[PDB]
Amino acid sequence: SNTLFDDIFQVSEVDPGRYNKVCRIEAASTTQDQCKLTLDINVELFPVAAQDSLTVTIASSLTRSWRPPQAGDRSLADDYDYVMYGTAYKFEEVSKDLIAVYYSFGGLLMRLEGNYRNLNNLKQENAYLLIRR
Amino acid sequence: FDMGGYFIINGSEKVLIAQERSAGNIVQVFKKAAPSPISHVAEIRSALE
Amino acid sequence: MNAPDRFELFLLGEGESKLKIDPDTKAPNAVVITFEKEDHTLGNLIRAELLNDRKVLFAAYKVEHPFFARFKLRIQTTEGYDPKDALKNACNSIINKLGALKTNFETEWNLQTL
Amino acid sequence: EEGPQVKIREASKDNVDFILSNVDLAMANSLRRVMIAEIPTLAIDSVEVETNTTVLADEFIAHRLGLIPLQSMDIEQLEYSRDCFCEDHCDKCSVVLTLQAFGESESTTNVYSKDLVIVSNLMGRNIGHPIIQDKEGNGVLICKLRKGQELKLTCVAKKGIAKEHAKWGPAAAIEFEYDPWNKLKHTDYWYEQDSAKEWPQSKNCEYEDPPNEGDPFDYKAQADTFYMNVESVGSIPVDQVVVRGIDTLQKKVASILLALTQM
Amino acid sequence: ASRHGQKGTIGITYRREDMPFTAEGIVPDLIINPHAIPSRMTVAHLIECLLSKVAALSGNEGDASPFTDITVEGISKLLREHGYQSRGFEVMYNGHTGKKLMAQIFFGPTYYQRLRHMVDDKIHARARGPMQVLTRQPVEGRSRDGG
Amino acid sequence: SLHKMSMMAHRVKVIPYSTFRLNLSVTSPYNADFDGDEMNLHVPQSEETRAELSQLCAVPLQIVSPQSNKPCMGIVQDTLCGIRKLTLRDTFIELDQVLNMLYWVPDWDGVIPTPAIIKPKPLWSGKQILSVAIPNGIHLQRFDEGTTLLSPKDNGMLIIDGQIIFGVVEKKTVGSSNGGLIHVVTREKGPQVCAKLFGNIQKVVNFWLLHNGFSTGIGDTIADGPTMREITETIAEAKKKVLDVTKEAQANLLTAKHGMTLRESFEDNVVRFLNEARDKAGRLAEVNLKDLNNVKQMVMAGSKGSFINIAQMSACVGQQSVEGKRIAFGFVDRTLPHFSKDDYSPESKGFVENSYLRGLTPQEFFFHAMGGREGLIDTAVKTAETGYIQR
Amino acid sequence: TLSHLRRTNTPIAKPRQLHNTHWGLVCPAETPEGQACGLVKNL
Amino acid sequence: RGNLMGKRVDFSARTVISGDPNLELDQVGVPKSIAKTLTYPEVVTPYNIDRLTQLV
Amino acid sequence: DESAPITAEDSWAVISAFFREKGLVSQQLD
Amino acid sequence: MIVPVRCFSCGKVVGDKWESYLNLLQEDELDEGTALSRLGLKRYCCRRMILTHVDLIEKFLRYNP
Amino acid sequence: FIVEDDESLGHKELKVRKGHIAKLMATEYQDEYTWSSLLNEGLVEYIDAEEEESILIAMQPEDLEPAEADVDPAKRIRVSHHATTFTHCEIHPSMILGVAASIIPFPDHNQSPRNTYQSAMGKQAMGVFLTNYNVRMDTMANILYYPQKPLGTTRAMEYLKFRELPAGQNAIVAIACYSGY
RNA sequence: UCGACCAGGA
Ligand SMILES: [Mg+2]
Ligand SMILES: [Zn+2]
Ligand SMILES: [Zn+2]
């Protein structure tokens, strides 16, 4: 029960291509030049234009049947606007100390390339995705 | 609305179907196949009207 | 010739109960109710109203085959809440709403000159 | 005012236009179904044919007698023969209509739904009278006769619902529409160039404000506000198609509560 | 069958309430599968329908005569003049839920023919019965109650 | 009964009404459609004779057929059309419907999956809830055109542990295809488990489709005015290309392609230019038709139709042919009495410039009927012939 | 009925095919699907 | 061919076919009338004596 | 004018005249 | 063959309008489209019922016994 | 129809003129100028397949007869009035079809075999075979209770009495995927 | 109930 990855990215391009509720986002980190990101986003519930500033967080938690809202005593780990649940399906060794991790949030794919997530990102399905701003 | 053009035989209504045939007194030339000792034939189905 | 009687849609057969409440083995605090001589009219209405109940974790209904006028309704509730009470409350909520609707329709109709 | 609100747009003898607000879609739809299929009506369900020298078949004539709308105001005080303790039928559970017609005239003799005669005792309850909406006061041309042409028959009208047979359908078409501007995105319009121009604007658009273009999609928003139009055939008045449809659905639910209490 | 070799037997009968519906309250008498159209290229079935929809609204007879100057574009213009969407489509609602169908259904009248092939004149079963004299095997045909 | 699969053991279900009813996926081995088809049923009378049916002849046992070492039954018609629609990136389901869709899978664990989208609205994808029907320990990886482990097109297929990771589910995945989900589930989990898979995929997709809908109208044959101009000038240019080859052959400049007549050579190049034209005129439509085009969606799912159907309905029917050659001079040096003698133009020898949407001219109509009659004969003969070969 | 009283039978080069000469004399479409295809013509 | 390689047989039925989405791959929908005609000779055993008595 | 050329619509008046005289089973009767 | 009581599709009484439809056509000289709408036949399902009817009973009535 | 080079007031034109057409319709309404009138006035002719070989037919009158001095993109693509040597004109190209194929709406918009299938199934469609079915004692008679004349009709149906004795009903049809039934 | 012809269905 803890955070796995956190960084702030800037959107290069936003591509729908035949999709009316989906867009494949292209973004690079502001912190590390070696870091890049590709992500399909449900733009209907959370729209993104080019040059946006988004905080992209992963985290393990906050195997159990899903429960409805009841937002009372709920530990609302939502300080973010966009939250997705996915599966890690590929761990690509993209040369050097650069490593790419592939996620699938019900078909909406994600590919995160970097270096230091060795002490972080697990091949363990159980992973969330949180985006604010 | 009944059109006629049919017969009544022992109660049942009968139609005489138009029967197709090759016309008579007609000259027609036909090429005969490769095994045959005859190359071409001129036929006439000559019959009285 | 192989067509069943039409009254078989709404009339309970020989030794047939309206409700058959069976506990669901798959999940805790879960139940499956079989509604005999009923269609989507009742089915969709209960499911929709059960969903309004925050103490209800799961509510779904299905007409397994359209030849037969029956349906199954699976209810799963919050530990401590009996799904039978969940259904009782949902039913009462429906009646109360319909009573309000009828009263409101009647007070509106009398305002007309046609 | 209370719970689900109602706003009557246009009322008449056979048509009611109204806006059903503060309701869930399931309730709006379940009411629609009940009005079509489950309000009890009175309709001819038995035809005994004494003479038929007509050009029409006995069951062809019988089929049309079922489809004839009969007065069904006090239908609630008539028993379903199935629950009535008699042998076959009686006054507690049925209405007996008589029909006798003969081609007196040289010209074609018409047989109308006015030509039916109540022969049973209505015990003063408003039932059985064939519904005449016709300008000339005849209503429904049952059959046409020549000269020596005769038709002598007896009809037994029983209480029933549309699920048993559509002849007991108290309502004709029911108009039903929500979200004239597709704000909920419950439909995805088929088009060639512009869906907005190719798809005709609903009359109901005048009762909801347009989506205001640049406004993002409201996912939170739910389907409430239903533009309805109930049409009555004549058996029961339009208001009663609504009221009794509301009442039947309530009774339908009450029987589940009843069942649970026996359990 | 329609008049375009577009035959098929009934598979179920639904009452008015279970049926999909236009806002107007019009309900189909028949429901045919869209899969019957592409491989068959029975375009005249779709045009008969568009023309018949107009004909019903206008009260004029639809001229579905062959080698004429009547175009789909022509028919569509007349339909849009009747307040419906030009290419026949109509927004329909699910009978069970009352929710709008995500798709728009090509709705309209079409001349359907009742064919002489009825199931109760075909349905046959035998479990022992009349046997032939010579061979001692079951007789032939449903007529004779054969195997 | 041309197949061992034409006779299969089935479990009775006494139902009302006068028709024998069958699961739609079983339709292909029997080669049945319900346009008036009748089927036979034989009751075993012995305990050992029932065991033969249940243990050897049973439908689930026949799923993977030894004819071509692949399944002989897959997901068809409604379910195939709806499974593509259900599994698009754009397709999302909210709680209410998800619960009903979950309750419909009989084998369902009673465990509601975590929605892909939690954020403002809890939303499940189509892939997500279709995966509930797919059993655990079912791994399948495909790769189509631009499939890159990040399939930007929603191309190929990747199923890990009976959960769809990426790809639109259509015929290549769920049909009676070689590496298909059905060949894999049969081999990996057994026949009785794959038989359940058919039912569950069906029960979920048919439910979803019931509430989503699907249709087809004239609108789906209509192509853009500009596309229609392009199509008209595409036929026009090919007519000129032919006329030019006609003028060249008339001035004795044409040279025959070995073992061929000058006429045999001219015809081949004429037939070619017109068939090239029908194809590019067709492709012009297929491209212009949006993804909303219902015909294109049935073509896309692999449920019904192919390119040629779009071509002939929307753009141009094409050249008509009897005995492999174009419409011959049945009359003295002309195809019909409406033409002059020695006319070899596309119109004369049976080319159909028009589309079924625009409608056929009386000549186009007669020639089209001529070619059609050839098909009707072929079907009738190659039944008595092909039938005896089987024996 | 009308169709029956306007029927033809051909008893037996390519008889079954729709000939060019059949224009306006015999129906191009109306023929049986069976083993009589092209032999049973209608005027 | 007609009487020995093939035969007309008892315990057989034929009727029009329809498709059903709510039937399992391996089931067949059998009209009640066809079930009422087509019989099976179940031997009276102690495991079915009560069941068979009830059918009779 | 009475000497004006015929239209495509006019041809149906000729066909009406054909069937008024001949009928549909003319071939069988004659 | 004789006017259907009630529309197949929506169940509206159409059977009490044959004479009225025919009168609006001959006597009133109205066009069919207008005639139907004057009878209150608004949806095309009702409109066909009357427009598309063939009163064969008038032919049948011509046979003496 | 006979086409003659002689038409003093111009070129090659059809023997039948507007007058003949009105003379015919006068006789149609008065129920003198019959089909036999056209034949004996030499405006129409009977051509067998052998005589057809020596003639040149035009498809349409008006369209295949003027000259040359924009085009609706919705219409079908037609050829031209290429020839001057026209001897005859087609009364109507829809007259190439028979009694069964004549009731198909728009057969010029269907794949040829589909039209063959209909002019086969139409023969098995219930309707009204004759108005005297009550006085006939036939083995088997099938009469459709409430026949309906088709909304989509052909001009040839007039002569076929289809509108008078129909064999179907105008069903409100939805082309959709519903329950999967 | 001996079986020949004709007409159909998939
Ligand atoms: Mg078939
Ligand atoms: Zn009683
Ligand atoms: Zn109606």
Residue A63: count other Cβ atoms within 10 Å of its Cβ.
6
Question: CA of E80: which chain D residue's CA is closest?
Answer: D200
**What end-to-end distance do the CA atoms of chain K give, in Å?**
53
Enumerate residues preceding breaks in chain J (C to N > 2.5 Å): none
Q: What is the CA radius of gyration of chain C?
A: 18
Greatest distance between any 2 Cα atoms in chain F: 83
- In whole angstroms, what separates CA D174 from the centre of its chain? 9
Residue F65: count other Cβ atoms within 10 Å of its Cβ.
16
Residue written as tokens 């056929």? F360
Strand L proximity: list residues 3-42 of G with CB under 7 Å. Answer: 9, 32-34, 36, 40
Strand L proximity: list residues 34-63 of E with CB under 7 Å. Answer: none
Q: Which of A109, A119, A113 is nearest to A42 (CA)?
A: A109
The CATH superfamily holding the domain A1-133 is Nucleic acid-binding proteins (2.40.50.140)
Q: Would you list the DSSP string of J1-65?
A: ----SS-TTT----TT-HHHHHHHHHTS---HHHHHHHTT--SHHHHHHHHTB--THHHHTTS--
F167 phi-psi bin (left φ>0, alpha ψ -120 to 50, beta other): left
Number of domains in chain J: 1
Q: Would you list the DSSP string of chain D?
A: --SS-EEEEEE-SSEEEEEE-S--HHHHHHHHHHHHHTS-EEEEEEEEEEEE-SSS-HHHHHHHHHTS-EEETTGGGS--TTTS-SSS--TTTEEEEEEEEE--SSSPEEEEGGG-EE-S--TT-SEEEEP---TTS---EEEEE-SS-EEEEEEEEEEE-TTT-GGG--EEEEEEEE-SS-SS-------SS-HHHHSPPPGGGGGS----SSPPP-SS-----EEEEEEE-SSS-HHHHHHHHHHHHHHHHHHHHHHHHH-
Is residue C104 within a helix (H) or strand (E), and if so which, with residue range? helix C83-109
Helix axes E72-80, E43-58, angle to 10 degrees: 30
Between CA D165 and CA C101 the distance in angstroms is: 28
Cβ atoms of E101 and F211 closer than 8 Å: yes
Between CA A117 and CA A119 the distance in angstroms is: 5
Tell me the chain D residues in contact with residue C47 when contact means C-beta distances shorter than 8 Å.
26
Given an 8 Å threshold on Cβ–Cβ distance, is H27 in contact with F13?
Answer: yes
Ligand nearest to the CA of E24: 3
Helix axes D25-37, C83-109, angle to 10 degrees: 70
Three-state DSSP class for F55?
Answer: helix
Between CA B16 and CA H33 the distance in angstroms is: 43
Residue nearest to nucleotide L2 (CA to C1'): E133
Q: Would you list the DSSP string of chain G?
A: -TTGGGEEE-----TTS--GGGTTTS-SS---SSTTTTTEEE-
CATH label of the domain that carries residue J34: 1.10.10.60
Cβ atoms of D97 and D154 closer than 8 Å: yes
DSSP assigned state of F112: P
Cβ atoms of J11 and J30 closer than 8 Å: no
Residue written as tokens 């589909």? K114
Distances (CA, A) of C58 to B19, C25, C89: 75, 14, 15
> Virtual CA dihedral for H26, H31, H37, H43, nearest 10 degrees?
40
Between CA F6 and CA F10 the distance in angstroms is: 12
- In whole angstroms, what separates CA F351 from the centre of its chain? 26
Q: What is the CA radius of gyration of chain E?
A: 22
- In whole angstroms, what separates CA B11 from the centre of its chain? 30
Three-state DSSP class for F225?
Answer: helix
Between CA K90 and CA F361 the distance in angstroms is: 14
Distances (CA, A) of K162 to D28, E114, K8, K94: 45, 15, 44, 16
Q: Quickly give A63 CA vs L6 C1' distance in Å.
A: 73
Is residue K115 within a helix (H) or strand (E), and if so which, with residue range? helix K112-121
E137 CB and strand L closer than 7 A:
no
Three-state DSSP class for F371?
Answer: helix
Enumerate residues preceding breaks in chain G (C to N > 2.5 Å): 12
Between CA F342 and CA F251 the distance in angstroms is: 15
Residue E128 backbone dihedrals phi, psi, to 5 degrees: 85, 140
Beta-bridge partners for F215: K176
Cβ atoms of K171 and E109 closer than 8 Å: yes
Q: Does E17 touch chain C (CB under 8 A)?
A: yes
Q: Which of D60, D9, D28 is nearest to D242 (CA)?
A: D28
Three-state DSSP class for K128?
Answer: coil
Q: Which of D156, D138, D136, D177 is nearest to D49 (CA)?
A: D156
Those residues whose C-beta lies under 8 Å from the C-beta of residue J48, and which sit 6 or more positions away, are E56, E109, K148, K151, K170, K172
- In whole angstroms, what separates CA F185 from the centre of its chain? 23
What is the span of the domain harbouring residue D143? 41-166
Three-state DSSP class for A57?
Answer: strand
CA angle K14, K16, K20 (to 5 degrees): 165
* Data resolution in angstroms: 3.2
Strand pairing category for K57-58 and K88-89: parallel
Residue E50: count other Cβ atoms within 10 Å of its Cβ.
26
Q: Nearest nt to F383, CA vs C1'?
A: L10
Distances (CA, A) of D170 to D43, D163, D165, D232, J13: 10, 12, 11, 6, 11
Cβ atoms of C38 and C69 closer than 8 Å: yes
Tokens representing D259 are: 């069942």
Q: Which spans in chain F are helix H?
A: 27-30, 47-52, 77-86, 95-104, 126-130, 171-174, 181-189, 191-212, 225-250, 262-288, 294-301, 307-310, 362-381, 384-390
Given an 8 Å threshold on Cβ–Cβ distance, is D220 in contact with F224?
Answer: no
Between CA H10 and CA H5 the distance in angstroms is: 16
The CATH superfamily holding the domain C1-114 is RNA polymerase, RBP11-like subunit (3.30.1360.10)
- In whole angstroms, what separates CA F275 from the centre of its chain? 22
Are D144 and D207 in the same domain?
A: no
Three-state DSSP class for A45?
Answer: coil
Cβ atoms of A126 and A63 closer than 8 Å: yes
What is the span of the domain harbouring residue J26? 1-65
Helix axes D238-262, C40-50, angle to 10 degrees: 70
Residue K75: count other Cβ atoms within 10 Å of its Cβ.
15
Which experiment gave this structure? X-ray
DSSP assigned state of F137: S
Cβ atoms of H8 and E140 closer than 8 Å: yes
Residue written as tokens 């030794």? C15
Those residues whose C-beta lies under 8 Å from the C-beta of residue F391, and which sit 6 or more positions away, are none
What one-letter code names the amino acid at H15?
T
Q: Quickly give E140 CA vs L1 C1' distance in Å.
A: 11
Tokens representing F214 are: 């699907």
Question: Which residues of G lie inside 8 Å of B (Cβ-Cβ)?
Answer: 1-2, 4-5, 7-11, 41, 43
Given an 8 Å threshold on Cβ–Cβ distance, is G7 in contact with B18?
Answer: yes
Q: Would you list the DSSP string of F165-182?
A: EES--SHHHHSS-SS-HH
Tokens representing E130 are: 């009349």
Distances (CA, A) of F152 to D201, F213, F287: 37, 27, 20
Between CA K181 and CA K179 the distance in angstroms is: 5
Distances (CA, A) of D250 to A18, A43, C101, D224, K131: 47, 42, 11, 20, 52
DSSP assigned state of F334: B
Best mutation target among E58, E79, E90, E92 (most J Cβ atoms within 10 Å) is: E58
Ligand nearest to the CA of D82: 2
Between CA A79 and CA A103 the distance in angstroms is: 22
Between CA C82 and CA B26 the distance in angstroms is: 98
Given the candidates 3.40.640.10, 2.40.110.10, 1.10.274.100, 3.40.50.300, the CATH classification of the domain at F77-212 is 1.10.274.100
Cβ atoms of H15 and E123 closer than 8 Å: yes
Distances (CA, A) of F180 to F74, F156, F174, F299: 9, 12, 6, 19
Those residues whose C-beta lies under 8 Å from the C-beta of residue G35, and which sit 6 or more positions away, are F380, F384
Ligand nearest to the CA of D87: 2
- In whole angstroms, what separates CA B14 from the centre of its chain? 22
Those residues whose C-beta lies under 8 Å from the C-beta of residue K48, and which sit 6 or more positions away, are none
**What end-to-end distance do the CA atoms of chain C give, in Å?**
48
What one-letter code names the amino acid at F355?
S
In chain L, which nucleotides are within 7 Å of a protein Cβ?
1-3, 7-10
Cβ atoms of F300 and F169 closer than 8 Å: no
Tokens representing F322 are: 């009897």
Is residue C21 within a helix (H) or strand (E), and if so which, with residue range? strand C19-23
Cβ atoms of C41 and E15 closer than 8 Å: no
CATH label of the domain that carries residue D83: 2.170.120.12
- In whole angstroms, what separates CA D55 from the centre of its chain? 31
Between CA F289 and CA F114 the distance in angstroms is: 37
> Virtual CA dihedral for K91, K93, K99, K102, nearest 10 degrees?
-130
Is residue H32 within a helix (H) or strand (E), and if so which, with residue range? helix H32-37
Cβ atoms of F86 and F169 closer than 8 Å: yes
Tokens representing F261 are: 């007549």
Q: Would you list the DSSP string of E29-89?
A: SEEE-GGGSTTTT-HHHHHHHHHHHHHHHH-SPEE--SSSS--HHHHHHHHHTTTS-TTSE
Cβ atoms of D172 and J15 closer than 8 Å: no
Those residues whose C-beta lies under 8 Å from the C-beta of residue A17, and which sit 6 or more positions away, are A24, F152
Distances (CA, A) of J11 to D238, D250, E17, F155: 15, 25, 13, 50
Between CA A124 and CA A115 the distance in angstroms is: 18
Between CA F273 and CA F344 the distance in angstroms is: 14
Number of H helices and number of E strands within chain K?
A: 5, 6
